[PDB]
Write a protein that binds this ligand. Structure first.
Ligand SMILES: [Mg+2]
Ligand SMILES: [Zn+2]
Length: 207
């Protein structure tokens, strides 16, 4: 139903790689009661937590896919169940998390019993928040491949137009760049081992 004992101990050790007093960004795709992509990012070290979750509500997921993240739902079937709750349980106590644009992070953490985590609300306008969007994707696109669908936005006077998909990890990186006043070239490093974020490794077909 969730993570094994081996896995929870690995996760506890991985969490030691977060500096509890350094700046930490957090962002999600999907609704706070039903997230499908979660990222945490410490720009000082370049360390990031990043993983995915299968949605419970498929109707809301399909609308989020068309207007936000473009994730194909079948790419989420091999995710590790219970990882979101396990990661949130494991975050350092009383740490300060920075988030942009909405109270989604607050509502996710509170729903999981982490009211100790203090949140800095950056009120960047949507336009300013994405000033480094293209540069971040160009530097880091190979860190997240999951945004495969066409994503659209409703236009000011009617109609639609294609936009770049919204990724929780790229968002953390580009939001920090916009608040910092510049995009650094930095080697980033995944905190979670790759064997923890995706589930099944048994060949479905012999070829
Ligand atoms: Mg987001
Ligand atoms: Zn992504």
């Amino acid at each position: 139903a969730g993570l094994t004992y081996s896995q929870l101990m690995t996760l506890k050790d991985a969490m030691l790689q977060l500096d509890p007093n350094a700046k930490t960004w957090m962002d999600i795709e999907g609704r706070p009661e039903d997230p499908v992509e979660i990222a945490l990012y410490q720009p000082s070290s370049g360390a990031y937590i990043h993983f995915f979750r299968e949605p419970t509500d498929l109707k809301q997921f399909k609308q989020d896919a068309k207007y936000s993240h473009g994730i194909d739902v079948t790419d989420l079937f091999a995710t590790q169940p219970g990882l979101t709750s396990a990661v949130i349980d494991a975050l350092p106590r009383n740490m300060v998390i920075t988030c942009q644009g909405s109270d989604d992070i607050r509502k996710l953490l509170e729903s999981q019993g982490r009211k100790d985590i203090k949140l800095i609300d950056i009120a960047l306008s949507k336009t300013d928040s994405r000033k480094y969007e293209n540069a971040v994707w160009d530097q880091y696109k190979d860190l997240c491949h999951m945004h495969t669908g066409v994503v659209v936005e409703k236009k000011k006077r009617g109609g639609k137009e294609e936009i770049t998909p919204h990724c929780a990890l790229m968002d953390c990186i580009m939001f920090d760049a916009a608040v910092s006043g510049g995009l650094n070239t930095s080697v980033l490093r995944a905190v979670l081992p790759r064997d923890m974020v995706f589930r099944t490794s048994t060949p479905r077909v012999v070829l």
